[PDB]
């Protein structure tokens, strides 16, 4: 029972033992299949690992629902470097490539172990009879949904086809499901269960925000002589990104930057198909070290830094994007820049969407959600107190006990000052 589990770790990757007992506690539950579960701890191996171990445990095949097509070539294909039979099922993947795969899930004891999925070719029309043949012959293990916070729409990132997905639980009780996310919201994982449609009860695996290798500080743009000094001079001690609202803005510091010494470069939907895979492979290579991106750039261990140049759409988002810093575990700084303007620029842009949505389909409790989000993130500037205490707040998170790790517990009278300085630069 628990021998099996510990043999086929240190087999496969190489781990004497689990980061945490909540990665037992998770993967035992699974291993089981006896319940529906839920983990919410930040992204890695960690989290991975509760359903990539019990997969191969049991017998049978599993539908990992993940919505980020680059994201399952990256765990797919590093996956293959550990000696696992897994496949990819997407949108770009060749009819010829299609037919060599629907043809093996329909088959006596198929070929692959692991099977990733999005949302829109799961529950397609197309798809839908060949899941069947698996459904009868008791070949679907598990039910994995990664990135689970899409079917919120009190979410940061809701992506309207996890919907589809919710009633896909209730109609095959056969296999239990597993819903992964980062965002511990208590209105979202509240809903996760509710809109999937989760076998009652859900035994819930949560991991705190807070890590000491972390340092959250805030600097304020409108109060800055050299902005392009400042970041460079951060972004010295340390790969690496540097997050920003648009795609001339980051292509504005991919150049800005390069010419200070510290090579960087940008990334966006603007550049082609071929080059947008290309500098994320150059990314890898440290031949971009520093990336200047946008929203879109959504896995590697060595990243000393995290700066947001521009506020971040909401407060659930800023979280998910800053703590991709340090996942080895080493040293990282996590720095936001704020100005009213900035944060007027993008609360405009904010009620115009919504504006529009009211215009087409009319008042929503939802519509109100995207407000509240940015709202949130504004006060975390603004506000006088502990980062990683406010992050504690938003999510409903334990405490932290912070020292050397934010800018409050560094100095909470130099940050506290530059607020009141802040009001006085209006007029
Ligand atoms: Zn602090």
Redesign the pocket.
């Given at each position: 029972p628990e021998r099996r589990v510990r043999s086929t770790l240190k087999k496969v990757f190489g781990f004497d033992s689990f980061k945490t007992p909540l990665q037992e506690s998770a993967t035992m539950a699974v291993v089981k299949g006896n319940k529906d579960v839920f983990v919410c701890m930040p992204t890695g191996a960690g989290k991975s690992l509760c359903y990539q171990l019990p997969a191969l445990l049991a017998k049978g095949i599993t539908i990992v629902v993940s919505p980020l097509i680059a994201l399952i070539q990256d765990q797919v294909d590093h996956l293959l470097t550990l000696k696992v039979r897994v496949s990819s099922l997407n949108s770009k993947l060749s009819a010829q490539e299609r037919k060599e795969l629907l043809a093996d899930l329909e088959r006596e004891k198929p070929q692959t172990k692991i099977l990733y999925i999005t949302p829109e070719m799961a529950a397609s029309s197309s798809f839908q009879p060949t899941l069947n043949s698996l459904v009868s012959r008791h070949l679907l293990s598990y039910l994995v949904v990664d990135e689970a916070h899409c079917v919120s729409q009190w979410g940061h990132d809701f992506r309207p086809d996890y919907l589809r997905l919710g009633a896909l639980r209730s109609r095959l009780g056969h296999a239990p499901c597993v819903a992964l996310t980062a965002t511990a919201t208590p209105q979202v994982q509240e809903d996760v269960f509710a809109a999937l449609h989760l076998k009652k009860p859900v035994a819930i695996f949560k991991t705190p925000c807070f890590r000491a290798n972390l340092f959250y500080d805030v600097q304020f743009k409108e109060l800055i002589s050299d902005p392009y000094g400042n970041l460079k001079d951060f972004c010295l001690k340390a790969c690496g990104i540097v997050y920003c609202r648009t795609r001339e803005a980051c292509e504005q510091l991919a150049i800005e930057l390069s010419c200070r010494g510290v090579n960087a470069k940008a990334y966006h939907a603007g550049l082609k198909a071929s080059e947008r895979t290309l500098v994320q492979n150059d990314w890898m290579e440290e031949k971009v070290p520093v990336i200047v991106a946008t929203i879109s750039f959504g896995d590697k261990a060595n990243v000393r830094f995290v700066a947001h140049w521009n506020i971040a759409k909401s407060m659930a988002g800023y979280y998910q994007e800053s703590g991709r810093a340090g996942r080895d575990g080493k040293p990282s700084w996590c720095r936001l820049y704020y100005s009213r303007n900035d944060r007027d620029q993008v609360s405009f842009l904010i009620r115009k969407e919504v504006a529009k949505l009211q215009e087409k389909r009319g008042n929503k409790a939802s519509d109100k959600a995207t407000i509240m989000a940015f709202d949130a993130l504004v006060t975390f500037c603004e506000e006088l107190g502990?980062?990683?205490?406010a992050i504690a707040k938003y999510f409903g998170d334990a405490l932290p006990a912070?020292a050397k790790?934010?800018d409050?517990?560094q100095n909470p009278t130099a940050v506290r000052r530059r607020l009141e300085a802040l009001e006085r630069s209006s007029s």
């Open positions: 502990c980062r990683h205490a912070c790790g934010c409050h517990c």
